[PDB]
Design a protein around this ligand. Structure first.
Ligand code: HEM
Ligand code: HEM
Ligand SMILES: NNC(=O)c1ccncc1
Ligand SMILES: [Cl-]
Ligand SMILES: [Cl-]
Ligand code: NA
Ligand code: NA
Lengths: 713, 713
């Protein structure tokens, strides 16, 4: 079946924008998961999960009679695909149950873990999502084994198809670095947005970098990958030592005994994979990673035995029954229990990556403190396990149920509570009028509000205009935000805000976060009026202003737009074509192709470009909201050519006269090139489309203004 | 960017069911194209098109000063991708403007034709679709050149993305037969569902079969491809000779001068392709097919000159300036005008495929009759041009505007007008009660109504329950329809109908078509009641009964379900896996993944399987409407294995006891295998889903019952 992808491999793919349609969703269009979950009897679900932990099924017998370690690993894998660079991956959509993650090598036998959970999923139905269930199950495993967790929030709605995530360019599972699609260059520099060392791994290779069992060098990979999953040294030590307090790895026999991953298995496997020909294929004979390590003397109970062993023995390199490198404490007594045979005992063992916690000098200091003070270890682990499993859930207003922690954490980009009456429709009209009377232009109002709102990304639900973080470090100095123009706009808006608030009774006041958005709305209103149309742009108050001290500057760095086609902005020269970056940004803002098209065409004529560029400003009435972008783009009287100076910039010349009419970028002209985008541009470029363009613009503008407004959900 | 496709090429792709979502569509969810078109001033559009004909643009100068031949070819390419095997392709969705058809080699320079039409599209906007516009423009070209058409209907709504059509497996454009992905086997047998000889062609190669200039062998390709586009010999001769009464071919220079097709061109080409380095690259220097043939002495006027030339000369094989095989008239004078130079004249020329009309013995008789009786030629061509350009539009009720021909044609599968009062809700209750009192079972009622309704396909809008064609040849004899059981159900329904009709006043009567569907509804009602649910199934009256003489038996053959997963039916052993055929069927029935899932699971427990097979009947209460299919399918206490006798049949055994619990086919078990389908099955197999399953079932059942009900649009 020869496809468009086969014929035109470098044509833009828009299907990423049309995933998650109502058509693939089996739940009614009005189904609200938050309301279902809020009525779940969470305590009853947790009791059933508690019981499950020790109810072994013969098709996948529980190690030591307890599935707790398997489920912790399952819930760490669920969360562990997260990358800070784009916010993609993580636990928040239950993507572990779909391709390709369900079949990543690192997720081997998590298909069994998920299947164990079906009777509980089935019992509670739509009141608990798979996504929430995987995480809750990990918490319950922890709790059943004597570990007090930090809390749990529901609200991760299920999804119904694979996300399209860029996992890397390798064509071979687990390919070692330095291949033709190497994800490394330079001095072991991992390409953004990746956060793992090989295709099909969660973070690092447990044997060591490309299989070399050097704990020192492995620690560098750990540090780099975990940092790209938003974890610092302290959290990383706490997470790895915490998790490896439980359970065991599986490598009872040679790896070549293991069959097809789930997406390649026969239909009879019924969604399961990695069927093994080694002895019984399961339990005592299980093969999962090929390693055979059990870390502690009580693999079903919380302890501080991981660090007691790590520091209390000297380690020697050895091989599992599958031939993988691992470490044994040879001077030791056989104090580790066997998973199935009460009359066998084993010496303590470790992975190369476990020894990293001791032989990296910075990790060693933390691991020693944790060893000496296991109560500090427990607290750091609980906090980190909460952060790991909740990092992609977005603002605190999405957290549901009775176990949400009250403590506000800095990583959550917190927004203060509103404790005063909000502005009403009449107040909003007064403020818009005052904004327009101050002299701020359509261009400044639209640019500023776009800058504040468009940091939002739906991947991890970070960013957006709530908080007024555009006035704080680092957003106020981002190049895309035009720091000097921004500072002048904000200074004027702040004076309007102070005057309005100082004149109120009854405690009523407006936040700067709200006023920035409302000022953008005035700007769009004025632009429509400049074109002869009276429109009201909807506006929802209730944003609040976060302080600098409530804003982690370093974690905010990943939200900087280095490409924003909606402002014709590219921070430097990238290997990825600019139109590809445009579609990527549109996906992160949750826009369909039509929404992207209308939004860009309007922004262009409103003066939202960075630096006042003329590129794509195909209008003689800038700051009027018209469909000029599309009418002039599609005009066959204009002929386009790449410039000599820059092949990514184009001149549009009158085809008869040679006269220079416009210039544009690849982001501009793709709307007149790509056959699906041009079809869209034609709608908005048609003679009956002026009203539709204005209405659809205003609707998409409003959608972007409200992206982070889960307080109104 | 390594994808799921790359990793698992034999994992079922469901995205074909979720195309044409509201997300990719720029028009509102309420936009109704029929209503927009009904207000278009069609006369004014036609005036503008007449003016266009001779308004030459410098970027693609009009041959002979008239774009008429270019536009006829454009409109015959639009319609010419149609295949009767699945109803896919054709003009009815305006797919020529998207990939891959916009870049098929056979559509070279039709990108210019469509660009000439942009000013008119733009002027009238949403009130005329591109899809309608391409065909209208062809009609107007014909009329401008002195040929009176048979009529025109609007109502082809635009689409907004590529359809996923199987065009063949070749990975090289135009690949000749016998390659690794050959579309031919045996004695030049073209694989279904294909209706062209090479990848990127409309029907046949104009040089001859695989480029061999044998007009006799070409005629065999012509006959076979045109038959697979629903045209007989008479229509085929009329169409080819009719079209080649106008215009010319383009091959002024070597084909190596021609650059990238539109989907491969640079962004600056703004959606156009095949830019040529030969001289001016256009007009007198145009290169399109590589052939250089002008058929008649008046290429811009209707004439009888095609047949005069074809019979009046003897032909000699020669080469165009591009090197293609073509034919020139022996000894003739230079009587053909040049397209640009009034002082140049040319000898009559022909394609190998034109000579087929003379040297194939059956075509020769028709061509001679057309030569001797030009009025029969003109009438046959008008009729065939109307059929070509409307064959995929569906029932007459979809035909809009003031030029619809009143004459009813056999190919339209016509349905008689209803000329009597319809049954009301009280009559429907009475009839359902009589149906249930007759002794017909849930299984018989559901199977019969499924059989009648599910012949519909949305690709060309043929089939469905309107007409009661299930009682006529050939449907009554189709194996999937269980001819003997069917005859007994119809016999009982026919008696109920006659008794009801005989007791009425005022001329009220019920059609057998309606009663079949109503009886299916009663069956579903009874099944819900067997499971303790009180369900009323919607029913819309108004179908009529078509006669045998209104039902072309041969044209009806392509609607025979040779695979119907909804009845666990496969007529023979196919190279395409059965689950792939299931998704294909779902696509033709216009169902989403959720709808397909719910529908199949219900039909299984209602007894809709062909031959009473137990396969997939995972219930101990057959003929009760429950979600048993899903609950049993997902039960991990059962293990599945392919049978020894047949690898496509599976046994599900109790994992503890080894006892046989069920059997199932690939179609059954794919729901427990594929990770997206299993996610859907889990919703319906959950403890809170019994009522949701019943309601969703009824909704999809009713959707299938109404698929052809364009009289209710
Ligand atoms: C450097 C990071 C890490 C690496 C390289 C790593 C590696 C592995 C490997 C190879 C296995 C064995 C899989 C098998 O053969 O069954 C495993 C098991 C496990 N890991 Fe990790 N791990 C990492 C971090 C984590 C974290 C952060 C957690 C949780 C907080 C976690 C919890 C576990 C648990 C509970 C198991 C036991 C599975 C069972 O009992 O079946 N690990 N780990
Ligand atoms: C056996 C079937 C056919 C073959 C192999 C065929 C082949 C071709 C080829 C190769 C061209 C030249 C393209 C170019 O170089 O610009 C052409 C032109 C054309 N054909 Fe056909 N054709 C077929 C049937 C039809 C039919 C059914 C129609 C209309 C009813 C049609 C109408 C036209 C017209 C009007 C042109 C002239 C285009 C112009 O003036 O630019 N043809 N044909
Ligand atoms: N490829 N096109 C089709 O199969 C189709 C189009 C519209 N409705 C149903 C099927
Ligand atoms: Cl994702
Ligand atoms: Cl199609
Ligand atoms: Na994410
Ligand atoms: Na079709």
């Amino acid at each position: 079946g020869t496809s468009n992808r086969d014929w035109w491999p470098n044509q833009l793919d828009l299907s990423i924008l049309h995933r998650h349609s109502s058509l693939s969703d089996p739940m009614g269009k009005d189904f609200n998961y938050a309301q279902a979950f809020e009525k779940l009897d969470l305590a009853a679900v947790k009791r059933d999960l508690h019981a499950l932990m020790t109810t072994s099924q013969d098709w996948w017998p529980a190690d030591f009679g307890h599935y707790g370690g398997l489920f912790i690993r399952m819930a760490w894998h669920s969360a562990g695909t997260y990358r800070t660079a784009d916010g993609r991956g993580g636990a928040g959509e239950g993507q572990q149950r779909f391709a390709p993650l369900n079949s990543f090598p690192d997720n081997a036998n998590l298909d069994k873990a998920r299947r164990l959970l079906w009777p509980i999923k089935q019992k509670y139905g739509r009141a608990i999502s798979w996504a929430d269930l995987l995480i809750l199950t990990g918490n319950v495993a922890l709790e059943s084994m004597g570990f007090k967790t930090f809390g749990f929030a529901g609200g991760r709605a299920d999804t119904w198809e694979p996300e399209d995530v860029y996992w890397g360019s390798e064509k071979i599972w687990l390919e070692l670095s330095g291949g033709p699609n190497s994800r490394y260059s330079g001095d072991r520099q991992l390409e953004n947005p990746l956060a793992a060392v090989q295709m099909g791994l969660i973070y690092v290779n447990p044997e060591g970098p490309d299989g070399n069992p050097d704990p020192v060098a492995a620690a560098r990979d750990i540090r780099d990958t975990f940092a790209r999953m938003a974890m610092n040294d302290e959290e990383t030590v706490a997470l790895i030592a915490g998790g490896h307090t439980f359970g065991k790895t599986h490598g009872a026999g040679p790896a070549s005994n293991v069959g097809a991953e789930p997406e390649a298995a026969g239909i009879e496997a019924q969604g399961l994979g990695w069927k093994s020909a080694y002895r019984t294929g399961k339990g005592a004979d299980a093969i999962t990673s090929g390693l055979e390590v059990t870390w502690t003397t009580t693999p079903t109970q919380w302890s501080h035995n991981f660090f007691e062993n790590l520091f209390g023995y000297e380690w020697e390199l050895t091989k599992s029954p599958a031939g993988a490198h691992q470490w044994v404490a040879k001077g030791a007594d056989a104090v580790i229990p066997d998973a199935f045979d009460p009359s066998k005992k084993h010496r303590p063992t470790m992975l190369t990556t476990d020894l990293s916690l001791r032989f990296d000098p910075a990790y060693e200091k933390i691991s020693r403190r944790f060893h000496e003070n296991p109560e500090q270890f427990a607290d750091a682990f609980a906090r980190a396990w909460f952060k790991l499993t909740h990092r992609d859930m977005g603002p605190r207003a999405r957290y549901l149920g009775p176990e949400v922690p009250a403590e506000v954490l800095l990583w959550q980009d917190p927004i203060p509570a509103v404790d005063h009456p909000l502005i009403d429709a009449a107040d909003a009209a007064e403020l818009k009028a005052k904004v327009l009377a101050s002299g701020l232009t359509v261009s400044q109002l639209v640019s500023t509000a776009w800058a504040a709102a468009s940091t939002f990304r739906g991947s991890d639900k970070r960013g957006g205009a709530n908080g007024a973080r555009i006035r704080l470090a680092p957003q106020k100095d981002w190049e895309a935000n035009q720091p000097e123009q921004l500072a002048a706009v904000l200074e004027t808006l702040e004076a309007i805000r102070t005057a309005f608030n100082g004149a109120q009774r009854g405690g009523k006041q407006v936040s700067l976060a709200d006023l920035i958005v409302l000022a953008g709305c005035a700007g769009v209103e004025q632009a429509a009026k400049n074109a002869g149309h009276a429109v009201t742009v909807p506006f929802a108050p209730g944003r609040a202003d976060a302080s600098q001290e409530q804003t982690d500057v370093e974690s905010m760095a990943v939200l900087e737009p280095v490409a924003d086609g909606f402002r014709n902005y590219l921070k430097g020269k990238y290997r990825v074509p600019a139109e590809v970056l445009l579609v990527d940004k549109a996906q992160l803002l949750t826009l369909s192709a039509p929404e992207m098209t209308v939004l860009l065409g309007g922004l262009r004529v409103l003066g939202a470009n960075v630096g006042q560029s003329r590129h794509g400003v195909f209008t003689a009435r800038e700051q009027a909201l018209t469909n000029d972008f599309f009418v002039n783009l599609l005009d066959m009287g204009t002929e386009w050519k790449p410039t000599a100076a820059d092949a990514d910039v184009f001149e549009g010349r009158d085809r008869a006269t040679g006269e220079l009419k416009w210039t544009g970028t690849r982001v501009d002209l793709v709307f007149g090139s790509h056959s699906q985008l041009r079809a869209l541009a034609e709608v908005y470029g048609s003679a009956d489309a002026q009203e539709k363009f204005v209405r659809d613009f205003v609707a998409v503008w409003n959608k972007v203004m409200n992206l982070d407004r889960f307080d109104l959900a």
